[PDB]
């Protein structure tokens, strides 16, 4: 009864169904994305790119372009170089 034939594993279809339902992240307008980024900047001084993506919920490439337009990354000697939301 072990390794019985199966078209797809239950864990795989459930994950696939969840991704399909959630769908891919869309490209929001720059103004709305900028407003969300600046609003969240008050909560903390610095954000990680991966963590910032979850908050903004925008494509990584699109988010990076917006962040590059204003934001910059500072080299930190404690963990690694991370993005700083302050343009200056």
């Amino acid at each position: 009864t072990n390794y019985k034939p199966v078209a797809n594993h239950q864990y795989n279809i459930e994950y696939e169904r969840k991704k399909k339902e959630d769908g891919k992240r869309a490209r929001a307008d720059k103004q709305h994305v900028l407003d969300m980024l600046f609003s969240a900047f008050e909560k903390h001084q610095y954000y990680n790119l991966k963590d910032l993506v979850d908050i903004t919920k925008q494509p990584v490439v699109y988010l990076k372009e917006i962040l590059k337009e204003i934001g910059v990354q500072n080299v930190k000697g404690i963990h690694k170089n991370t993005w700083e939301l302050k343009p200056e």
Binding site: T1, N2, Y3, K4, P5, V6, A7, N8, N12
Partner: protein, 252 residues
């Protein structure tokens, strides 16, 4: 190369490991033949990726108790496909699982795509996608599976006697020969044939039981069984002992 005999086939000698003129006796080469060896008497990404893929292949094989020869054949297929690099985009696990499927087919002991999927994290859909790509890349082919290619594994996994397996093999082959199930998958026919033979013997297996081992939904078994049920007396082997008479086989 006897100086007296240009173009002479020197005879290898194992006494000292030298080649002697076939008709002079002159020893050309003192002890150059190396008799003992001849006659039986910091890892690269490509290498590391192959290493992990080989580990996955062996891990998959042990799950379904495959012999090492199939694993070796699978490893050779992966090297060809991996080095050819037509499937670089595809995940190595999918390539390995498809290679394992091909290796089983090439050795005459096919495992159904569901059987290979059950031992791999890759879905059956993706294995089929990589299966077709591998054949194109390697310019190879696999002989079409038959109903009898699964009778031994299925019947053995169902704890069915040898006579039931023999009858099941005969029924499935005869049904295909009579074209009673045109277009049906061989696995579906094999499961239905097993069900008919099983129901006609002391060891009776339900539709659900055969589906689980065969990987075929009981509905699919029901459809194929319904097609062959009318010709039940003809499909059964002539020298078969019916615990349950053919006329009293389940109807559904």
């Amino acid at each position: 190369t006897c100086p007296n005999h240009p173009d002479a086939i020197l005879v290898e000698d194992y006494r000292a490991g030298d080649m002697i003129c076939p008709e002079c006796g002159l020893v050309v080469g003192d002890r150059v033949i190396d008799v003992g060896s001849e006659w039986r008497t910091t890892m690269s990404s490509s290498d590391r990726a192959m290493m992990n893929a080989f580990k996955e292949i062996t891990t998959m094989a042990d799950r379904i108790n495959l012999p090492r020869n199939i694993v070796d054949r699978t490893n050779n297929l992966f090297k060809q496909v991996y080095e050819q690099k037509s499937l670089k985009g595809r995940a190595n696990d999918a390539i390995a699982s498809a290679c394992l499927y091909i290796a089983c087919r090439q050795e005459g002991v096919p495992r159904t795509f569901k059987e290979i999927c059950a031992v791999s994290r890759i879905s059956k859909k993706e294995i089929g996608r990589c299966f077709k790509l591998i054949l194109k890349a390697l310019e190879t082919s696999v002989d079409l599976i038959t109903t009898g290619d699964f009778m031994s594994r299925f019947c053995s996994n169902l704890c069915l006697p040898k006579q039931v397996q023999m009858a099941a093999t005969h029924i499935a082959r005869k049904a295909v020969e009579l074209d009673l199930v045109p277009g049906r998958s061989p696995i579906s026919v094999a499961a239905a044939a097993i069900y008919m033979a099983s129901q006609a013997s002391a060891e009776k297996r339900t539709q659900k039981e055969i589906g689980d081992i065969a990987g075929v939904a009981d509905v699919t078994i029901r459809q194929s069984y319904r097609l062959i049920y009318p010709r039940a007396p003809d499909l059964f082997p002539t020298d078969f002992k019916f615990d349950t008479p053919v006329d009293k086989l389940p109807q559904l």
